[PDB]
Amino acid sequence: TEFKAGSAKKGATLFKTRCLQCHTVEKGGPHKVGPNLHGIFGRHSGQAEGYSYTDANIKKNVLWDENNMSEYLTNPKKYIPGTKMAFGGFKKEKDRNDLITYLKKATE
Ligand code: HEC
Numbered sequence: 001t002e003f004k005a006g007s008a009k010k011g012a013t014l015f016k017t018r019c020l021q022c023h024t025v026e027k028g029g030p031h032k033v034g035p036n037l038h039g040i041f042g043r044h045s046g047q048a049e050g051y052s053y054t055d056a057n058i059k060k061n062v063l064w065d066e067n068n069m070s071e072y073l074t075n076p077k078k079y080i081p082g083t084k085m086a087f088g089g090f091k092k093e094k095d096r097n098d099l100i101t102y103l104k105k106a107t108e
Pocket residue numbers: 015018019020021022023033034035040044045046047048052053054055056057082083084085086087103
């Protein structure tokens with residue numbers, strides 16, 4: 001719709017430098033500050049096992065699809081008030097395009 005693929009290698013690195021601190025993407029990868037992100041697309045928020053998500057994340061019951069992840073990536077707190085995710089966001093659409101590209105390939 002409003003989602004455009006960019007670079008997976010670029011996105012791989014945005015992840016490492018901006019998301020790796022609190023999340024893993026691999027299947028069998030563990031939860032850390034953040035929950036493991038394997039299989040997140042198609043998935044609704046707050047459903048990873050062994051993970052304690054805020055009341056905020058839970059009740060948002062957001063269906064993770066690439067378009068959705070873009071709004072969130074711009075301003076998670078604005079997008080999900082009450083969330084403990086400590087990420088200020090991606091204001092540049094290319095950044096978001098590029099990371100979603102990566103996530104879409106890495107989390108499947
Ligand atoms: C790099 C920009 C990041 C991406 C992609 C994601 N995050 Fe995080 N994140 C953090 C916490 C503590 C939570 C849980 C929130 C709560 O329980 O209130 C999250 C949550 C997410 C989610 C939603 C997960 C779901 O199953 O619904 C996604 C898609 C997500 N995060 C992607 C913490 C952190 C964090 C620690 C300081 C960082 C750097 C990031 N998150 C960055 C990213």
